[PDB]
């Protein structure tokens, strides 16, 4: 949801796909371009995109979100998420 924790491997977001989708394509055609350089450019190229353009991919991430939602049912307990709770005073 808002943020997970170590363990449950979170799914790839549309932000990653778009990259991994042009990551290799950028190399094959442009090998001289170093691994990073190739991405560094693909990243800034995704931030300049429009809303709709992104939506098209945003659906590719949500449609697969059904996975993370399943890895939560079990993580609903103190198995993946941890918190601290104090104990108040007592009474008569």
Curated annotation (Swiss-Prot):
Location(s) in or outside the cell: Nucleus
Source organism (scientific name): Homo sapiens
DNA-binding region: 8-76
Chain's role: Probably involved in the repair of mismatches in DNA.
Upper lineage: Eukaryota, Metazoa, Chordata, Craniata, Vertebrata
Subunit structure: Component of the DNA mismatch repair (MMR) complex composed at least of MSH2, MSH3, MSH6, PMS1 and MLH1. The MutL-beta complex is a heterodimer of PMS1 and MLH1. Interacts with MCM9.
Annotated protein name in UniProt: PMS1 protein homolog 1
Membrane spanning stretches: none
Gene that encodes it: PMS1
Entry's family note: Belongs to the DNA mismatch repair MutL/HexB family.
